[PDB]
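Input:
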Amino acid sequence: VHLTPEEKSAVTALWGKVNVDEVGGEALGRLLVVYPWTQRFFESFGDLSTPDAVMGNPKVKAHGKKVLGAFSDGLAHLDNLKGTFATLSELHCDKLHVDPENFRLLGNVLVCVLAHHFGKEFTPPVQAAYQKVVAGVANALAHKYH
Amino acid sequence: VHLTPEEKSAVTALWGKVNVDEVGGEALGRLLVVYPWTQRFFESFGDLSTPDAVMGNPKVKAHGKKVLGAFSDGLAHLDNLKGTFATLSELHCDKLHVDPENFRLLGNVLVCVLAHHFGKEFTPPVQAAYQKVVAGVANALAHKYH
Amino acid sequence: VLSPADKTNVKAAWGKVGAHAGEYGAEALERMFLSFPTTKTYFPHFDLSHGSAQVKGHGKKVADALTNAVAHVDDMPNALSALSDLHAHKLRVDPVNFKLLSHCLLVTLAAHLPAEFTPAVHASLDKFLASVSTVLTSKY
Amino acid sequence: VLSPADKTNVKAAWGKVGAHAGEYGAEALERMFLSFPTTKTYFPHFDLSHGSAQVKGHGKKVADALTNAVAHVDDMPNALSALSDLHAHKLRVDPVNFKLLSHCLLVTLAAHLPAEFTPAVHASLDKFLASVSTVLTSKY
Ligand code: HEM
Ligand code: HEM
Ligand code: HEM
Ligand code: HEM
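Output:
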C-alpha cells in the first residue's frame, strides 16, 4: 500500500512463516462464526449450524485456502493491489454479489488469526503494517464495483 | 476522485447557485445540533444549548462561512484536493486535533442542506456526484494525519 | 433514546409525508443505489432501472414499515419484530448498509419538506432512523 | 444480546487474563494508536510513546472497567452508567472509535491466550465488546 520499506520487510518476513492452508481455513471459518450473516454466500457448503460444524467443514477449509492463496499472491504486488485484483474485483461484484464490507471483516479476522498464531512475534508495529495491507486489499477488491 | 465529466458539470452548475455564507452557517450549525458530540471543539463559541442557540450563534455562522469558503476553493481544484488541502490537513491534525470522522459527518449534513435548499433540482444523480465530492474532501483533509 | 420532543417531531414530519410515503421510499432507494453502489449487491434479482416497478414496489414496503414504526413509536421493538427476524435470518444485510439507507431517506425528506425540515426536526428524524436501524439489526 | 454461553465464554476468558489485565489494557491502546493513528486525536495531553506511564495507567483504567463489566455482565447498563455519562457528556469520543479499540483488544487477547481464544470464544468476546460499546455510547 503506502508501506515503508521497514513495514514491507515486516509483512514479508512473517508471511514466509505462514502455513496458508491452516490460516486460510481458520480465517474463513472464524468469519462465518463471528459474523454469522457472512454465511449467506455459502449455503451450498452444508452445515454451518455450529462453530464446530463450520470449523470442520472441508468446503470451508478449501475455500479458505483458495482465498488466502490469492491474498498471498497479492503481497507480491504490493505496489499495485489495484491491478492485481482487478479481475477478482469484477467477479465479486458482477458474479458473486459480495458486499465489499465483507472484505473488511475478513481482513480483521485475518489479523486476529495471525496474532493467535504468532503470539509474541505479532507486535504492535507488525500489526500496524498488516492493518495497512488488509485495508489495501479490501480497497483493491472493491475498486471495480459499480 | 472519480468524477465523470458530466458529474463535474453537474457539481459546478449547482454550486454556482449556492450562497456560501448562508450554506456554510447552516451546515455547521446543523452538524452541532444533529451530532452534539461535535460541539467538543467549540466551547469558546458560547451557548450551544438549544437549536436556536446554535443556529443563530454569530460565531457558528462566521466559522461555517470560513469552512465552506475553504470548501468552495476545493471545488476549483477537484484534480488535486490532496494538494489543495494539505496545510489544512496538517493544521486539523497537529493543532486542532480533530478526528477525521467529523469531516464525513459534515459531508453528509452538507448534502442534506443542498437537498433542503434545491428541492427537486438535487436529483439522485446530482446527489451521487456530491457524495463523491464530499468523500474526496474528507479524504484530502485526513491525508496528513499521523 | 427518543425524547418526547423527538416523538412529536417525527409524528409531525411523517404526518406531512402522508400519502407520498411510498414514492419517497422508492426515491430513497434510487438515491442509495446511485450514491452507494455496493448496496446493489443485495438486489441482484431486481430490475434497478429508473422507474423499475420492483423498486416502486419495494419503496412502498419500506415506507409502510416506517409508517408502522411511527404508529407504534412507544413499542418499536415489538411492532418491527418480524422485520428484525427477517433481516437477521434470511436477508442477512450487513449492518453498515442501514446507515446508508437512513442517510438517503433524510435526503429525500429534506428535498420534499423544505418548511418542516428544520434543524430540530432533522435531528429527531436522524435519531428515529438510527433507532429503526438498531431494531432491525438487533437479532443479528 | 449476550446468550448464557457467551457470558460463560467471556467470564472464562477474562478469568485467565487475571493479574495481566492492566498490561493487556496498555498493549491494546498501544496497538490502537499505531494501527489507527486518528484515535490519537483524543489524547493530545498524553505522552503516546512506548511504555509511557500515561498509557500504562490508562490501560489499567480501561481494563478495570472491562472487569467490572464482566462481573456485571447481566447489569451492564447499570454497572457502567457513570462511564456512559463521562463519554457522552465530557469526552465525546466519536462512536466509530469504539470498534477500533474493541478490535485491538481482541488482537491482544488472541496473542496472549492462544489456548482459550477459540472460534466460539472469539465470537463471544466480540459481541461483549460490542455490547460494552453500545452502553458506552447509549447517552450520546
Ligand atoms: C481477502 C479477500 C478475498 C479474496 C482474495 C478472495 C478471492 C477469491 C477467489 C480467488 C475465488 C475463486 C473463485 C473463482 O475464481 O471462480 C473466490 C470466490 C468466492 N469468494 Fe472471494 N475472496 C475474498 C473475500 C471473500 C469474502 C470475505 C467472501 C464472503 C464472505 C467471499 C465470497 C466468495 C464466494 C461466495 C466465492 C465463490 C466460491 C464458489 O464458487 O463456491 N470472498 N474468492
Ligand atoms: C469540509 C471540511 C472543513 C474545512 C474545509 C475546514 C476549514 C477550516 C478553516 C479554513 C479553518 C481556519 C484555519 C485557521 O484557523 O488557520 C478551520 C478551523 C477550524 N476547524 Fe475546520 N474545516 C472543516 C471541517 C471541520 C469540522 C467538521 C470540524 C469539527 C467538527 C472543524 C473544526 C475546526 C476548528 C475547531 C477550527 C478552529 C476554530 C477556531 O478558530 O477556534 N473543521 N477549519
Ligand atoms: C431501516 C431501513 C429498512 C427497512 C424499514 C426495511 C424494510 C423492509 C421490508 C418491509 C421488506 C419486505 C419484506 C416482506 O416481503 O414483507 C424488506 C425486504 C428487503 N430488504 Fe429491508 N429494510 C430496511 C433496510 C434494508 C437495507 C439497508 C437493505 C440493503 C441495502 C435491505 C435489503 C432488503 C432486501 C434485499 C429485501 C428483500 C427484497 C425482495 O426480494 O423483495 N433492507 N425490507
Ligand atoms: C472499550 C471501551 C472503553 C472503555 C471501557 C473505556 C473506559 C474508560 C475509563 C475507565 C476511563 C477513565 C475514567 C476516569 O479517569 O475515571 C476512560 C477515559 C477516557 N477514554 Fe474511554 N473507554 C473506552 C473507549 C474509549 C475510546 C474508543 C476512546 C477514544 C478513541 C476513549 C477515550 C477516552 C479518553 C480520551 C479518556 C480520558 C483520558 C484521560 O484524560 O485520562 N475511550 N475511558
